[PDB]
Design a protein around this nucleic acid. Structure first.
Ligand SMILES: [Mg+2]
Length: 221
DNA sequence: CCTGTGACAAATTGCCCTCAG
DNA sequence: CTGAGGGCAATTTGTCACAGG
């Protein structure tokens, strides 16, 4: 039953750092954007509906959905084919009434959310909601960019490019760490908490790894 | 140069309780 | 009963020294 989340490939591949909680909210606006046209670009958020859709308590849910908002100040996203740096909101959010929050999306993002009828990413929210780690979030998010209908696919990604688009810590430049605190972690989270069955092999030129080749079956078979 | 691992610091997790309405 | 607050211990995340190929 989770609402199918349908995003521009543009989005799937862009450069931003958002928290777990924050990306969670990301999925929710773009849905309200999808029932929008010729838009105003304002979005409502209902605390009760959050803690039902993400299995939280009323009280904890209202922490997650407050802090996150304050830490959208500053947050940007860079678009590429291009070096076009954008910003998430224009006025901060607020709650006219008890429980509802009205955010104000930069309406110069609307077409970058509908993108193109040619190339776009889809998935259902049910897949992703038991992920704690966000980097795991971006990955499954891209991994779906390539899924063919039966739930399977293949892809090679390049380390210099994962670092940019997903915008990871500088200390991960050394691979020994990269594979410890990002690689084995995000493959373990996905292959545990989602309906996907992953594995990986490294692509090495010379004395250095450079690509990761991701390869996945829908666990449903 | 490459790597893996330990140890320490700094940020998250979910869980707890107060209080106003 | 709800949600706007304060606080938390345990684990998960970011860093870097050191040992060997
Ligand atoms: Mg929380």
């Amino acid at each position: 039953n989770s609402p199918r989340i349908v995003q521009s490939n543009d989005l799937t591949e862009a450069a931003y750092s958002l928290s777990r909680d924050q990306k969670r909210m990301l999925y929710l606006f773009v849905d309200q954007i999808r029932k929008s046209d010729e838009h105003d670009g304002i979005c409502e958020i209902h605390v009760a509906k959050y803690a039902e859709i993400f299995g939280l308590t009323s009280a904890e849910a209202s922490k997650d959905i407050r802090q996150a908002l304050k830490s959208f100040a500053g947050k940007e996203v860079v678009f590429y084919k291009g070096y076009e740096s954008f910003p998430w909101f224009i006025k901060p959010a607020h709650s006219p009434s008890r429980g509802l929050y009205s955010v104000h999306i930069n309406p110069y993002l609307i077409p970058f959310f509908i993108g193109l009828q040619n190339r776009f990413t889809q998935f259902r929210l049910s897949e992703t909601k038991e992920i704690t780690n966000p980097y795991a979030m971006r990955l499954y998010e891209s991994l779906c960019q390539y899924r063919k209908p039966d739930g399977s696919g293949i892809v090679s990604l390049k380390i210099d490019w994962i670092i940019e688009r997903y915008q990871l810590p500088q200390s991960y430049q050394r691979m020994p760490d990269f594979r410890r605190r990002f690689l084995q972690v995000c493959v373990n989270e996905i292959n545990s908490r989602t309906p996907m069955r992953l594995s990986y092999i490294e692509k090495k030129k010379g004395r250095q790894t450079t690509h990761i080749v991701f390869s996945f079956r829908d666990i449903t078979s």
